Amino acid sequence: AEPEHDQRKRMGLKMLLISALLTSLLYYMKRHKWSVLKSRKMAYRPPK
């Protein structure tokens, strides 16, 4: 029924690894760029 059974699973293995890695790296990058806004501070200094 599914002659590709074995190959499918070998791919699934690599998919899981690449995904773990890539998701992590991209998570960092997103956090990196957004750190600018995440830690950003502000104040309201109206005149006299």
Please give the residue ranges that form the binding site for ligand BOG (CB under 6 A): 3, 5-7, 10-11, 14-15, 18-19, 22
3-state secondary structure of 48: coil
Smallest gap from Cβ 32 to ligand BOG, in A, equals 20
Closer residue to ligand BOG in complex, CB, 4/44 = 4
Query: CA 6, CA 12: separation in Å to the nearest integer?
Result: 10
CB of 42 to ligand BOG, least distance (A): 38
Closest residue to ligand BOG: CB criterion: 6
